[PDB]
Chain A
Amino acid sequence: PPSKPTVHIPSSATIGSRAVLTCSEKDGSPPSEYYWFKDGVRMPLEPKGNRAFSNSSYSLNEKTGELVFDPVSAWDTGEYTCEAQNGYGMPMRSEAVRMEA
């Protein structure tokens, strides 16, 4: 399965800045993917949709969890967390962490 994955988060970025969030795991066999939360609800694959995230802007490297915020909008504040899963066992989740604009 995935082990509990590592992450890296700046707790607060500047409004209209750039920011990056990652989630890493070691025991992924097959390689564990990564999917992000925000206040619990899982993050889309793109902000491009009627998602409440049409204003925001980012991309994903779901195999790497390399979540972007380029630019960082004001509303992009949230409780972000990744959910590691190789589609086997159980999806393991990282710590609870915030981010602020």
Chain B
Amino acid sequence: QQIELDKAALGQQRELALKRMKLDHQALNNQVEQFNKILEQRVQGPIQSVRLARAAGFRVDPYSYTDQNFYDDQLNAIRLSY
């Protein structure tokens, strides 16, 4: 009667490591949209920040709107898996 336990315990390695393999897909599928998002906000964030502050009536300071520094958050979200 070691068969019904092996028929199911094939079988627990199987659908567990499945999820493991699945979850490692969202480990990077989430990462890319955690990165490809950057190149929009690389231009889009500033466009919205200035579209925001213009509502009130502030100065705009047309040199510092472009961050370009803090948008090196790619630098940690860059893979080099190894």
Do A and B interact directly, with beta carbons closer than 8 Å? Answer: no
